[PDB]
Amino acid sequence: MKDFTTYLSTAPVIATIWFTFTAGLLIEINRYFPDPLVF
Amino acid sequence: FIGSSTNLIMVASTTATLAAARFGLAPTVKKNTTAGLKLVDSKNSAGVISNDPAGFTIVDVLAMGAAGHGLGVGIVLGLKGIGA
Amino acid sequence: DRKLWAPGVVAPEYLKGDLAGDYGWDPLGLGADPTALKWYRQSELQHARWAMLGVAGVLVQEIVKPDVYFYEAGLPQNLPEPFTNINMGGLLAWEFILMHWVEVRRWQDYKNFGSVNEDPIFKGNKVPNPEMGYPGGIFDPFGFSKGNLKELQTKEIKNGRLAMIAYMAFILQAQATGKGPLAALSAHLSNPFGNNILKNIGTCTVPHSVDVQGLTIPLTCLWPGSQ
Amino acid sequence: KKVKIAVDRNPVETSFEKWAKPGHFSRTLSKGPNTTTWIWNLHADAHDFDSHTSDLEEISRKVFSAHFGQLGIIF
Amino acid sequence: VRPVWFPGNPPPAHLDGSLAGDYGFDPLFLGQEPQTLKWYVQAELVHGRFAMLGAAGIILTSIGAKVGLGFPEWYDAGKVVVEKNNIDFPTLMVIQFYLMGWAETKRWYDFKNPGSQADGSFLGFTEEFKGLENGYPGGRFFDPMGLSRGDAAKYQEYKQKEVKNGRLAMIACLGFAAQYAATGKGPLDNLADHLADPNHVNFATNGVSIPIA
Amino acid sequence: LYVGASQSSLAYLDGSLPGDFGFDPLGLLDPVNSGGFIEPKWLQYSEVIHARWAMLGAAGCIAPEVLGAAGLIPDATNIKWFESGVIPPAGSYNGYWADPYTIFFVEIVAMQFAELRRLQDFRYPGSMGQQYFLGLEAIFKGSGDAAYPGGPFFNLFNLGKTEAAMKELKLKEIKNGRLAMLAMLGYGAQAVMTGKGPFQNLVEHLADPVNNNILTNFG
Amino acid sequence: YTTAIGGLVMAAAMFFAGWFHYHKAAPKLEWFQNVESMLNHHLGGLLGLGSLAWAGHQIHVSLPVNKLLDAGVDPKEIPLPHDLLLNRAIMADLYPSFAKGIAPFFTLNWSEYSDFLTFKGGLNPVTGGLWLSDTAHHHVAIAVLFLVAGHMYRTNWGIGHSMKEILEAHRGPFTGEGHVGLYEILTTSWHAQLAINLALFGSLSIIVAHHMYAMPPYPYLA
């Protein structure tokens, strides 16, 4: 399990998870707050 | 079907191909052929045991039966195509 | 050596012939554990005695009362006077209390051998209890235990096993033909080639359920026969 | 001369130990990165099976398993 | 030596039979690490206790619903309670989250630092929050009867009973969810329907579990 | 001994295994560089398992038709083996105590218990005789050969006490099983070809062998 | 949906096969070097059996369903493929030769099967694609030809051909030695095999593009 977690801690896996989280957050924000142009 | 032209041709083709390989006239599992179509000894990996005096194994029966069936099918379909 | 259950078979190591009626028969190895073997011996003795009582009761009831079906004798409307149409709740209460007391005493005797022999009310009234499942004393007032107890125990266990098989035979005969053992025997004697298991099987004469006074009790046959 | 099924039993142990060690297949990449070039090299020699080892049997086994992975992706 | 989940297979090295309900069941090696295993033990204990409470409540409410007592089903009890009584749903959510947050945060920081909640910073209580073992918080508050500080063998037996009952309750809660999602009725209604005709009223005849049936 | 034998198969087929007639033109029992499932132990075990299952299958596929022809069983029963509920498009029987899926789930649990315990005795010899199984572990110890466990239940009457008698009975078992496997293959081929039961095919062939065979059943 | 589930199952089987063949049962080098056996299996088994199986599906499913579709029958009213495969009455009504069963195939009366095995050519005027009877007959001929081609190389018996002997026997006065050493090159270098396979594979893909636009094989494709 330690080796598997270390593999999950590698740069491509971490980048994939982080970008999926960031993209999901932005998509959900644009979904609940459609068409945001100004503050 | 028994005694018809198709049955007689197929039986004759199978018997002819089986009799040729057994009497040293066609390639077998024991005798191969060179580039000049001359019979030469082979080096079969299986080495199928057979009580037959000429070394005729079941593999020879299957090969000759398939070749004879192909020849008989071709002859029957060819005669049916030319009106004979 | 003793005769085994089959010619050429080898008896297990734990079956050395100590218990009565030992034929070295244990295809499932359930007697490998000594504690489990003792408990199973007590269970076999209980089943044997209860089955002998049931077989004798069914036969005597069919002889004395041939117009009463033993399968439906448990219904309150089929009870004899003055117990006919009696409340089954009080009857179940009586049996539950008495049977619970005697079975708890027997169970405690199994857990701790020779610890409940004395009467809890009148001190001094004890049973000898030489072996588990054989209390004696008040249970044997005729004094038939002062002799060859081994052959008598063998006869008891063999008769009990035969009675177990016979009682299950009675149950399946009643579930497939709708009559008692003597009635089934007479019916088979009338036409052996017409009345047998070849044609009586596949039919379940027991109804789906029965309404005992106020509540309904579901019923079923041992095999999926035609209702 | 004899056509038969020749198979070795349990040659590689299934483990996640090498999953945490990038560039293990290459002797030069197993040391670790010092420059960014290494990262690109890690992907430029991943399927270069004949470059990792000179054993034809190991290369053939890797190719055969890679073919199964490709068929799984296609499926 | 001890019975395992799948007979014949040796148990894993990280499961030596010391924990309660140890049957060597870890094919994915999720609890291979010691700290992760400790965290998972506390998670399983919390899950089992919550599932036990949920199963007991569901069974009691279903019993009251089957007899003429007016009880609602478990899948409608929340709506019935919020509408029958003037209870605001977000307010109840916030109150529950406040109380659960306090209790769970104290339990969490006690897991990170064992015995740290026994300093007396919470109203002066010291021995009531010291904690006996991981996932087993003994004391006068959580164990007023003192069944964990007497007859060690009985305590181990009760630990085994607790973990097994918790696992069974978790399976029961999953069964409640699946039965409501498939049949659409209460759990006791499904039990009564099955007792009425077990050969034709089961998951093989509901038309949802087996689509090819 | 049989047709198709060769010197290549005779190298590893010395006659130790039951039913060893030197018939292996495909060389599936070569111990050199063998692994996975193509190895002597698994292949011999699979052959005896198929033999026993096919023996039960052949007897069970021909028993209802034969018993129905003699009048021993009623007319509601006595249906073709492929119309008993196995393949619903080919026919099904609605006289069971439950639907076939309920019975199938019962079979799933039952077969998983039996087959998985059998597999564990094959993987770990004697492992089924230690863990508690309601006292049944005393008869699941097996022996050295997974194909022949024996014990108080699997060898109920202690048949084949002598080594020669055991070898003789093992040869009889493997031969009967191979015959049953060929019979099951014939049952399936006759079911697809004629669309009738095997006993009906045998009766029709015995009535007129020239006009009832695979040649006349083509069209 | 059922095909998608089957594809997922096949994908799981492929991944399991790769893991099993790399970590549990790995083939030896001599197993990979059996080019004669591999070619025999790929020609006969893979290609020939795949063409035969697809011909069977076309004869039993594609031809009747598409015939009813082109006749104007609604897809819901068209019988299911298993219904077509279970009784001979529906197939006999759609194709009279099915009334004789597989008897004309064994009695060398193949001309009877001319209702579903034709040489129409051109295109279907209703759908614009190739006649499915022609495609079914095409796959039948392809299956027979590939099955015949799969019995050319020597594997474990005397019959068959040795590619090394064939390559060594081809030598003219303008090329010196000839194909000597080519058998060893193609049985020991994966890159040479990849080069040959990639070249023929790309050429075949281009040929596929040309033949597919010129002779549209699918209905409503042109």
Ligand code: CLA
């Ligand atoms: C590129 C494809 C490929 C190739 C070349 C091989 C080659 C090999 N495999 Mg393998 N395998 C494959 C794919 C392949 N496999 C896949 C996809 C799986 C997952 C299902 C497996 C799982 C697998 C296992 C578990 C094992 C092998 C084994 C073996 C080795 C010997 C056994 C054998 O295959 O002989 C002949 C094959 C058999 C005797 C069994 C065939 C039975 C199938 C069901 C026949 C039907 C398949 C056919 C495609 C379906 C026809 C259509 C039907 C509807 C009519 C051999 C070197 C064995 C081994 O390691 O030996 C050392 C072994 O144990 N394979």
Ligand code: CLA
């Ligand atoms: C979960 C099971 C499992 C485990 C624990 C291992 C473990 C191991 N394998 Mg193995 N293997 C497996 C399954 C497994 N394998 C399967 C299913 C296959 C068949 C494909 C293989 C075939 C295989 C080969 C041929 C080799 C190994 C090797 C190894 C060892 C080191 C390589 C490594 O894992 O780095 C990690 C590598 C990766 C994580 C790459 C994964 C790439 C996958 C298969 C393709 C993904 C496709 C992607 C989604 C599509 C690209 C599009 C893009 C936009 C995303 C290691 C001990 C190597 C070795 O032993 O070195 C000598 C060796 O060469 N394996």
Ligand code: CLA
């Ligand atoms: C009739 C036997 C047969 C069949 C059908 C195949 C089929 C295949 N082989 Mg294989 N091969 C065979 C015999 C066979 N082989 C023998 C005897 C040898 C040893 C001399 C090899 C050695 C070999 C190698 C070295 C390789 C292949 C590869 C392939 C695949 C090529 C991918 C493709 O484009 O096809 C189309 C794809 C499909 C049709 C997908 C369907 C796959 C199913 C499961 C059919 C596979 C059947 C096969 C016999 C496996 C059954 C064995 C059983 C134990 C499971 C393909 C599926 C390549 C590969 O490994 O791919 C993984 C490859 O590298 N083969």
Ligand code: CLA
């Ligand atoms: C791979 C290709 C393929 C396949 C799978 C089929 C399959 C089938 N064809 Mg077909 N056909 C094909 C190609 C194919 N065909 C081609 C190329 C042509 C053109 C010449 C034809 C022309 C054709 C015609 C004209 C007819 C068929 C018919 C049939 C069906 C019955 C065959 C028959 O009559 O008895 C054949 C008997 C067997 C194949 C033996 C069956 C073997 C069984 C499965 C063994 C099982 C044994 C097993 C142990 C059982 C135990 C079960 C277990 C659970 C206990 C059948 C489903 C007939 C039909 O469908 O009627 C409408 C029919 O009339 N075909």
Ligand SMILES: CC1=C[C@H](O)CC(C)(C)[C@H]1/C=C/C(C)=C/C=C/C(C)=C/C=C/C=C(C)/C=C/C=C(C)/C=C/C1=C(C)C[C@H](O)CC1(C)C
């Ligand atoms: C171990 C392992 C590891 C390896 O490696 C792998 C694998 C196999 C994956 C594994 C397994 C896993 C599993 C089985 C899991 C499961 C769990 C569960 C089921 C939980 C539940 C759990 C469950 C739970 C808690 C539950 C609870 C419940 C509750 C609260 C309830 C409540 C309620 C009530 C009263 C009533 C009302 O009216 C409503 C409500 C509100 C609703």
Ligand SMILES: CC1=C[C@H](O)CC(C)(C)[C@H]1/C=C/C(C)=C/C=C/C(C)=C/C=C/C=C(C)/C=C/C=C(C)/C=C/C1=C(C)C[C@H](O)CC1(C)C
């Ligand atoms: C030897 C050799 C050598 C070389 O080298 C290689 C080769 C060539 C490969 C070889 C050969 C092989 C072979 C021949 C095989 C075959 C097999 C079989 C046939 C199986 C079956 C097998 C078969 C089987 C199991 C079967 C079974 C059956 C069964 C269970 C049945 C059941 C049933 C019954 C009762 C009745 C009902 O109503 C139905 C059912 C429910 C359905």
Ligand SMILES: CCCCCCCCCCCCO[C@@H]1O[C@H](CO)[C@@H](O[C@H]2O[C@H](CO)[C@@H](O)[C@H](O)[C@H]2O)[C@H](O)[C@H]1O
């Ligand atoms: C090559 C072997 C491997 C491929 C196996 C293919 C078998 C597929 C299994 C499904 C079998 C369907 O096979 C089906 O057999 C039945 C047998 O009743 C035939 O059925 C037809 O003929 C029979 C008589 O022979 C009639 O009694 C029946 O009413 C009629 O429908 C169908 O024409 C055929 O389609």
Ligand SMILES: CCCCCCCCCCCC(=O)O
């Ligand atoms: C496609 C096969 C073409 C066969 C060409 C035959 C050449 C005959 C000359 C053979 C010379 C020899 O065998 O010595």
